[PDB]
Paper text:
Whereas the fungal enzyme belongs to family GH114, the two bacterial enzymes do not lie in the current GH families but instead define a new family, GH191. The putative active-site residues (Asp156/Glu225 for TmGH191, Asp323/Glu391 for Env-GH191 and Asp157/Glu225 for FsGH114) overlap well with the experimentally verified nucleophile and general acid/base Asp189/Glu247 in Ega3, Asp196/Glu222 in Sph3 and Asp160/Glu223 in PelAH.
The enzyme from the environmental sample was tested with purified Pel and showed good activity towards the isolated Pel, with a preference for GalN-rich oligosaccharides, confirming that the new family GH191 has members with galactosaminidase activity, with a preference for partially deacetylated stretches of Pel. While the GH135 and GH166 families are both retaining α-N-acetyl­galactos­aminidases, GH166 enzymes also have a preference for partially deacetylated stretches compared with the GH135 enzymes, which is in line with the observed specificity of Env-GH191. The two GH191 enzymes overlap well on each other, with an r.m.s.d. of 1.48 Å over 252 residues, while only having a sequence identity of 28%. To gain better insight into the substrate interactions, we docked the substrate into Env-GH191 and FsGH114. Whereas the Env-GH191 binding crevice seem to better fit the galactosamine oligomer, the FsGH114 crevice can accommodate either an acetylated or a non-acetylated GAG oligomer equally well.
Residue numbers in the entry: 197 to 468
Write the structure that this text describes.
Amino acid sequence: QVPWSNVKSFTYQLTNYPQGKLDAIAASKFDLAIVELVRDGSSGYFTAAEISALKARGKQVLAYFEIGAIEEYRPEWSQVPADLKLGPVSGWPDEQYVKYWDERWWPIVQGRIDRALAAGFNGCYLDMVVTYEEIPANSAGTNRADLARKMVALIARINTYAKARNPDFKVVPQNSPELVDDPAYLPAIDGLGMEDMYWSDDVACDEGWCEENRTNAARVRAAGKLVLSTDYATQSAHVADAYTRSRAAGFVPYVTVRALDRVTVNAGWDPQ
């Protein structure tokens, strides 16, 4: 395997696995792959044998899963009572933000960690960290800063649990880099995934919020964590700009399509 410290490229695909298999990802030349635990968006977990097949080609493999929301099409839906739900993510009630600090949410999270370990992933790639800021500020009867501390506490809980079972198992939150301000954050993570720092569907991330994301990523990188940047662009000047600026900042870039439904290969930028 490529060591964690020498990861210099990654691909990232969450759906549309051909024939429900990882063969195209296995064949690609990236140092690291982010894939779902499941081949079907639901309960068809990839097996140790399938994950081993990627690792044998030298890749680190991270398991994407959400820690801040649940969806009706996911197997744990029926374990989530109404009291854990905080509202629709994108208007559709079949995708709900959850009370991620609640002890009743922990078995769902734990079960995903356990599945990641059972399939021999190298680590986890944690989505819906942003739940901390997307739910009402009074969701825990407190405020936004308390919700932030709760989300960092959950990431730290994940890390301690996972490392106890595999001390090599990496923890990589996606987005929400500003959580780095909490002292419990950097001791709980091994890397950070950041979307949309440079190019978002071929539109520049040129707002103040973009710059704050980049400088918070710089904070995480300064603490020796792997930063995997994903940008979304097909225009060649934009692809080049994301790769160039990401690498200049000390990050590891990938540029792909928002659907995350294929292994994009950007000739001249990605390994071939």
